[PDB]
Design a protein around this ligand. Sequence first.
Ligand SMILES: [Zn+2]
Ligand SMILES: [Zn+2]
Ligand SMILES: [Zn+2]
Ligand SMILES: [Zn+2]
Lengths: 204, 204
Amino acid sequence: TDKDKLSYSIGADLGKNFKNQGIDVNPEAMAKGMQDAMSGAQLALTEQQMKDVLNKFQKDLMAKRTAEFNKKADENKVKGEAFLTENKNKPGVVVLPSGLQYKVINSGNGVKPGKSDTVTVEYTGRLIDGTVFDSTEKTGKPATFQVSQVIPGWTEALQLMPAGSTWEIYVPSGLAYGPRSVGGPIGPNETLIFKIHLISVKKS
Amino acid sequence: TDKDKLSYSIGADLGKNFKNQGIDVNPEAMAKGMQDAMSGAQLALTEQQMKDVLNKFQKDLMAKRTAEFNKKADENKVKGEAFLTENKNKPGVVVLPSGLQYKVINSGNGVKPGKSDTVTVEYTGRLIDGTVFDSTEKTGKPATFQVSQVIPGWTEALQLMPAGSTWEIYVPSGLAYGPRSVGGPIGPNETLIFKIHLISVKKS
Ligand SMILES: [Zn+2]
Ligand SMILES: [Zn+2]
Ligand SMILES: [Zn+2]
Ligand SMILES: [Zn+2]
């Protein structure tokens, strides 16, 4: 029946998650507790008891995540440097003192923005694996930022770009979000790629 | 074993939650999905399929919450008015045009704050059932607010209180948080009680 239908779905949903993480269990004793709970029956474990163990489960989960995080970080830095080394050679790529690299898609003729100016742009940011994490295409509307409020790579690139230009920049993690990053698709020590079209400079 | 131990705890934890809410299920088909998932076996339902039904489960959950919310709201207003009606009589209670009620614990002799002044106070806010939702006792440190940035009942009361006084105010929901309130311990149309000690007035 409709009941039977959903129940499976929820558990299928749940069960995957656990596994994918690190929750090594036995759905038999686990199915047991569920029935106790719903039947409002007396629980095989003291409120305290459970909490005591759950509290230890999370603490150990936290340890696990931190493990992955620090491992991902070391991994992405390694991948990040391989990408840039590989890219340094590619046709049209210029490498700057800061390690920031760019390739000119189309050169503009307007003024280059200063450190304090406001800029209007259109862009798409992607990870080395093509995954798009941000872009003005979705919103269909250009973005406006103050040159100094953006990530270092952008700050470094914009000061070199004539208004009207379209560059593709390749950003070392130290010039993007760095070792930290419990944010969106961007992880720790992730090197990023951006296609940036600088529309105009507001020397405000 | 240690495994068996935890598994139960998690499921006991989970199972309660569902029940307490409205998730009428059968932990048998639900235990089934969990095993499929972990064994990485082929799932009895198409990725789509499950989502299709889960998406419908939440939407129906949302309907359920909204149900409770609106019901709680009508309930708390009724309780709120019974409390104030009962309280209007009690020794020392003054009822104001706005329905706000207060009782003077101890009268100060300083100046009464104006609408724009900053005030320094110590206080404890509780629901009609004694549940404390806020207080400066916990932090051990007085709070400072601008008379107009606080809830109406407070704004109404403070303008009447001589600096140094300690009043207990009984606040109609329309002068506290009103019909809205997906916040802390405070729900919809909840009438509140406060013990407020006005320490000083900064006629800033
Ligand atoms: Zn365009
Ligand atoms: Zn353009
Ligand atoms: Zn005190
Ligand atoms: Zn005092």
